Amino acid sequence: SRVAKAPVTVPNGVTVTQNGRQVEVKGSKGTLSFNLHALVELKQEEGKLQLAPAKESKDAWMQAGTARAVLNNLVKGVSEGFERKLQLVGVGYKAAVKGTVVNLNLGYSHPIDYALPEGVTAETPTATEIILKSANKQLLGQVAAEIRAYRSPEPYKGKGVRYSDEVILRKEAK
RNA sequence: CCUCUGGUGUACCGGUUGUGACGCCAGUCGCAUCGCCGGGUAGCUAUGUUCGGAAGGGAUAACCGCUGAAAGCAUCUAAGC
């Protein structure tokens, strides 16, 4: 695996520790832990880190590549972090933030109150846009997916919640 | 279930025909589908009354995913959620 062979960089301020199979990553953002597969081994020399299989199995190489990708995501998140961003298209579609809760008006007969999970924060510069930030890329993606699933986009006028860089399939009636 | 509305209610009350008897009048009783007819207490009962299939947890089906390599991309999947 070219991915597994590629090294990951600990930039300056994040510390990677290990105990058993539980590799922990520490930074200004916070703690992030990742259980590690039995067939993969991790070597932390100098700033860099190297993932390599404990044997010569294709399964071991696959697990090593997956572990390397996940740990690169973790170290990138604890230092810079990820933001997703979400748009709202349609008349009267609006969003607002009250602390840990997002208020959404999406054309239903009732408003929707989404409780954000611990670790992800949201901003609404304008009522049409939402910006979500977190150090956990998977958690950020899951939250964005749920908010989109509240009203996924429709193909005739593109109305509904969408990702910022999302291609929308548009057809025409009749 | 029987408070209400009703049915039934041949051991509750009354009207009335024929006949026989209680010595006779009066008053009663036997028999005639409970003789026939009109009501009707409890009980039982429906067509009457009240109530029920409300709400919530867990694992899932098709299906939709998050992150993610094998396969530098992509990918709901092989780890994991």
UniProtKB/Swiss-Prot annotation:
MF term (GO), any: rRNA binding
A Pfam family hit: Ribosomal_L6
GO cellular component: cytosolic large ribosomal subunit
Gene Ontology biological-process annotations: cytoplasmic translation
Gene3D superfamilies hit by this protein: Ribosomal protein L6, alpha-beta domain
Keywords associated with the record: Ribonucleoprotein, Ribosomal protein, RNA-binding, rRNA-binding
Protein family according to the UniProt entry: Belongs to the universal ribosomal protein uL6 family.
HAMAP family in the record: Ribosomal_uL6_B (MF_01365_B)
Protein's job: This protein binds to the 23S rRNA, and is important in its secondary structure. It is located near the subunit interface in the base of the L7/L12 stalk, and near the tRNA binding site of the peptidyltransferase center.
NCBIfam families xrefs: L6_bact
Subunit and partners: Part of the 50S ribosomal subunit.
Name recorded for this polypeptide: Large ribosomal subunit protein uL6
Species for this entry: Acinetobacter baumannii (strain AB0057)
